[PDB]
Amino acid sequence: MRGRDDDDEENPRDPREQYRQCQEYCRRQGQGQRQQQQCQIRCEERLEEDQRSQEER
User: Fold this and answer.
1) Sign of the C-alpha dihedral computed for residues 47, 50, 56 and 57 taken in this order
2) 3-state secondary structure of 13
3) Is 32 left (phi over 0), alpha (psi -120 to 50) or beta?
4) What DSSP line would sit under the chain, residue for residue?
5) What is the domain range of residue 41?
6) How many domains does the chain have?
7) Is residue 57 one of the residues assigned to a domain?
8) DSSP secondary-structure letter at 8?
9) Is residue 1 a part of any domain in this protein?
10) Does the residue 31 lie in any domain?
11) Contact 10/42 with Cβ under 8 angstroms?
12) Which of 16, 30, 40, 45 is positioned for an S-S bond with 35, CB 3.0–4.6 A?
């Protein structure tokens, strides 16, 4: 774009902290490699999904 948009800018909140939370939850509850992929994937979309929503308030 001619100017600078906010889509290419990182959100003020740290996504890593909540991402780490998913990893702890998944390991604590669940069994098998297949489930490990399932918990990480769901959290990944949600993580990106959360930033799109934006909550400045």
Assistant:
1) negative
2) coil
3) left
4) --S--STTSPPSS-HHHHHHHHHHHHHHS--SHHHHHHHHHHHHHHHHHHHHH----
5) 15-51
6) 1
7) no
8) T
9) no
10) yes
11) no
12) 30
